Symmetry: C2
Subunit: 384 residues, 2 copies
């Protein structure tokens, strides 16, 4: 019973935090019950209601979270289905022309074999639903057409059914509280700034706290380029929905600003590795560089926090001279290790000392990786 | 025409290199044409051939690359379909009992809404096909059952059709040249050793070559734990297929040995970052530590190469005292920087000079991360 409390809590916790799941499930439920209500109350005549399941099963099979996703995946499945339709109907008139059972058997071996590879090819890894709905539509059309004499009228009826289902699908998805895929990416390029500034602050302050929240911080930023590169495929399909003024919005720098950041979060990786490493500097020697090591972590996060606030607001005003206090912090960090360098050099009696030299110069590097981002965001600030 | 040559080459190159795609497409083609041949030549009577498309569309919808995947995903879809069947038939006898159009409309809004969340919950992210085939089977059964009087005989017929399709599906997938998901993971835990030993050798030898192949090396090992954790879900479903002697084979250390390796390939990340960093040691100063820096990279790869050859062979003989020459190499590397330490310490005139403190003590660390793996593989060598 206590475990079941969490399951209810899990739904509530993901619910109250993000009111985008409840609304999506409400939208799909509404679409399904509207199709069913239309079937039962407005089309009760059995003259032709069998195919009425096309109508409710197409709403279920083509309704997805983001307008871009629904629209592009509908386009790909429509190309697969219509290509199978044209090619299969050509093969169907042929396959009635005189040994047609054997010809129509080979005509499905060939399609299965050819479509399988282009499904399995490494490049076409996300265009897999298209190959499934093409291999699975060739087969259906071909069997039904070998069975029936004049298929094309029933094919016309099936298309208006899968246009009466998908019509309501797209309409309800786009008009009733839409969920775009453009601002699912503008709210993601600005999320990584927030969970990297803490990863920087976690790794600078976890190194010294003596006498994981960090591991979930920076691994989200790094593991998003495989995602933002998808949300860049979905983002091109939406209209200029609101602030995103014109068509051809540069959803190419949001994977470039998140590119220079994910490249700047490859020191915070090794910056964390120094605290997880089996060799690390002793407590008493870390706490001689306490100020400057904290000084970079303190100010270094403040900039990278408000670099996000320059994306969330997408402030068409400017990032003017951001890195002065991090440069000063890094410069006098190095000049601070110029005096107390004997704590870094003369087996293991010197392998542990010297890992304190490895953090100090994995943190100055992060200061240098931080000039690349501001330029990779200065292009995005102006032209976008 | 020249670009089209590559497309043919791409299929051939992925074909001749891996003869696992051609055989899979041949298997799916054979299944589809056998179902079609069975329909046309052995069941030509139209007394009942409409549902004969269940038979060919179920082979297409449930045939997958690995026996484990086909079998587990068939089990999940069967649970979804049979659960929708039992619950929907209960709702169907009720939904004929006396305002049943409105009750049967609400009975599909409720199912859509409830199933949407458990599809969208973060945990149930791979169990998404199950929720789609449950939401999409409740709907079909319920519409058809509201339409027809005594559905259960037609439901029995549909189940023997989707047992005459899936029967041939599983049979052809398992008997005609099977493709397991256990040895798709034993051949993957041993692949990461081969593309990390080169990443180590690339980053040690790319640092010095003056007077990307590495970036594809270690990023494959790190980006596989999200994959090997799936191949651990598929691996439990196969029988003891061959060498994997008994049931309950420990496919839990292959994600633990590949866990200690992916944890050892987090220095080779930062080891590479030092050559991509905007601050790096000068040429003339790198080539004073040329021998020992190469010495660790040379011998350090030789061990990690033959750690794989202790997995590919899965040699039930032993990894006896592997790390002696890497320990000596790391020990006298540190003792080599004990003499020539003035090249590491006394703004930027010393930020570049101390980048050698950070390669040499990002490479001694990799030697220490390498004791964890041999222990995390000594457990796997004995009990597996």
């Amino acid at each position: 019973y206590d475990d079941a409390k969490d399951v209810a809590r899990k739904a509530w916790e993901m619910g109250v935090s993000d009111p985008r799941k409840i609304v999506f499930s409400a939208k799909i439920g509404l679409a399904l019950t509207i199709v069913a209500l239309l079937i039962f109350y407005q089309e009760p005549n059995p003259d032709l209601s069998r195919y009425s399941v096309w109508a409710i099963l197409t709403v279920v099979v083509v309704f997805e979270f983001t307008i871009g996703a629904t629209l592009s995946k509908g386009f790909n499945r429509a190309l697969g289905t219509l290509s199978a339709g044209g090619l299969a109907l050509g093969m169907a008139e042929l396959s009635t022309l005189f040994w047609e059972e054997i010809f129509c058997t080979l005509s499905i071996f060939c399609i299965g074999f050819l479509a399988t590879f282009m499904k399995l090819y490494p490049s076409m890894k996300a265009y897999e639903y298209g190959f499934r709905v093409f291999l699975l539509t060739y087969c259906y059309i071909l069997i039904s057409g070998f069975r029936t004499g004049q298929f094309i009228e029933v094919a016309i009826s099936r298309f208006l059914l899968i246009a009466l289902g998908a019509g309501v699908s797209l309409g309800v998805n786009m008009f009733i509280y839409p969920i775009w895929a453009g601002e699912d990416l503008h709210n993601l390029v600005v999320k990584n700034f927030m969970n990297v500034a803490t990863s920087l602050e976690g790794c600078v302050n976890g190194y010294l706290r003596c006498l994981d929240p960090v591991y979930k911080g920076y691994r989200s930023a790094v593991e998003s380029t495989s995602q933002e590169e998808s949300l860049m495929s979905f983002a091109i399909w939406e209209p200029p929905h609101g602030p995103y003024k014109s068509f051809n919005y540069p959803w190419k720098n949001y994977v470039k600003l998140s590119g220079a950041l994910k490249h700047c979060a490859f020191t915070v990786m090794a910056l964390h590795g120094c605290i997880l490493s089996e060799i690390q500097a002793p407590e008493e020697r870390r706490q001689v560089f306490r100020q400057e090591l904290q000084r970079v972590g303190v100010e270094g996060a403040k900039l990278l926090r408000e670099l996000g606030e320059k994306v969330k607001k997408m402030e068409k005003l400017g990032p003017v001279d951001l890195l002065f206090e991090v440069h000063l912090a890094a410069e006098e960090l190095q000049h601070k290790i110029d005096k107390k360098s004997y704590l870094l050099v003369n087996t293991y009696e010197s392998a542990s000392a010297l890992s304190l030299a490895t953090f100090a110069s994995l943190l100055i590097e992060f200061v240098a990786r931080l000039q690349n981002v501001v330029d990779a965001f200065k292009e995005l600030s102006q032209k976008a």
